[PDB]
Assembly symmetry: C2
Homo-oligomer: 29 residues x 2
C-alpha cells in the first residue's frame, strides 16, 4: 500500500474540474 | 438563479486539487 495511486486519482479529478470549466465557459459565453 | 456562482465553486475546488497535488509531490519526493 502506498500513496502512488493518488497520482492517477488527482490527475483525473483535476481533469474533471477542467472539463466542467470548459462547459461553464460555453454556457456563460 | 444562474450558473455564475459556479465560477467560484470550480475555482476553489480546482485549487483544492492543486493543493493536494502539492502535498502528494512532497510525500513522494
Amino acid at each position: 500500500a502506498s500513496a502512488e495511486p493518488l497520482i492517477y486519482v488527482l490527475l483525473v479529478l483535476t481533469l474533471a474540474l477542467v472539463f466542467l470549466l470548459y462547459k461553464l465557459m460555453k454556457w456563460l459565453a
